[PDB]
Design a protein around this nucleic acid. Sequence first.
RNA 1: UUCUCCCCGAAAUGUAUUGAGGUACAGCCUCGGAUGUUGACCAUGUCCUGUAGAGCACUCACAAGGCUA
Length: 69
Amino acid sequence: MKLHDLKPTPGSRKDRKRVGRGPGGTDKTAGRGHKGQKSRSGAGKGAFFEGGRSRLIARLPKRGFNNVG
RNA sequence: UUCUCCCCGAAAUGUAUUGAGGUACAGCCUCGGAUGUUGACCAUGUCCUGUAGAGCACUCACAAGGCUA
Ligand SMILES: [Mg+2]
Ligand SMILES: [Mg+2]
Ligand SMILES: [Mg+2]
Ligand SMILES: [Mg+2]
Ligand SMILES: [Mg+2]
Ligand SMILES: [Mg+2]
Ligand SMILES: [Mg+2]
Ligand SMILES: [Mg+2]
Ligand SMILES: [Mg+2]
Ligand SMILES: [Mg+2]
Ligand SMILES: [Mg+2]
């Protein structure tokens, strides 16, 4: 058939965010707002009072059956 | 921190922080889905309040006389 007339399903393919690159969209700061937002990123489940700091009740093992309703 | 036009559009508040020009959560923005008038204004009904004013009935302050250990 027409290898030139292969067409990807509309949708599916979508273009990448090219970030820097102009006051036509997402200019100077690259979607980042003028901040203490700077390259070498550091943290993901942390603030400093942590509060995932509730207490624990603990067993080690487990074992279980395959189910056949 | 570099190419274009189109649509919407904020925050500089709260609480926490060896925290205070940083950060977490919330708040406020946008997008898609769901409901689908529950939103907005203004009206009537109803309930709550101690400010403006005022007043000395209590507390404190206080002006001229009277009576008076
Ligand atoms: Mg864009
Ligand atoms: Mg800068
Ligand atoms: Mg670096
Ligand atoms: Mg507009
Ligand atoms: Mg507190
Ligand atoms: Mg701060
Ligand atoms: Mg947030
Ligand atoms: Mg929506
Ligand atoms: Mg409603
Ligand atoms: Mg209504
Ligand atoms: Mg008054």
